[PDB]
Specification:
Chain lengths: ~30, ~55
């Protein structure tokens, strides 16, 4: 429920953080 | 968008490829720089010496 609230928060954090590192690798 | 990403990945590959190809050109160019310098030094020492040798 809000399990999914806090979970979508931290999980899209890890997900878009990894993809942020991916595009950051494309830059760096 | 994945094909756009495919373009992006090939682009980063080609960018680092351009880095290293400029590096390969620089490696030969500095190899050439040292070749002209040191080979020039050797032939010059040899030339004034052989001048000195036969004239002596």
């Amino acid at each position: 429920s809000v399990v999914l609230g806090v979970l979508i928060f931290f999980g899209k954090g890890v997900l878009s953080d990894l993809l942020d590192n991916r595009k950051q690798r494309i830059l760096n | 968008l994945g094909d756009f990403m495919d373009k992006r990945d090939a682009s980063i590959k080609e960018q680092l490829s351009g880095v290293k190809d400029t590096s390969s050109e620089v490696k030969q160019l500095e190899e050439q720089a040292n070749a002209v310098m040191r080979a020039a030094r050797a032939e010059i020492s040899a030339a004034l010496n052989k001048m000195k040798k036969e004239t002596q």
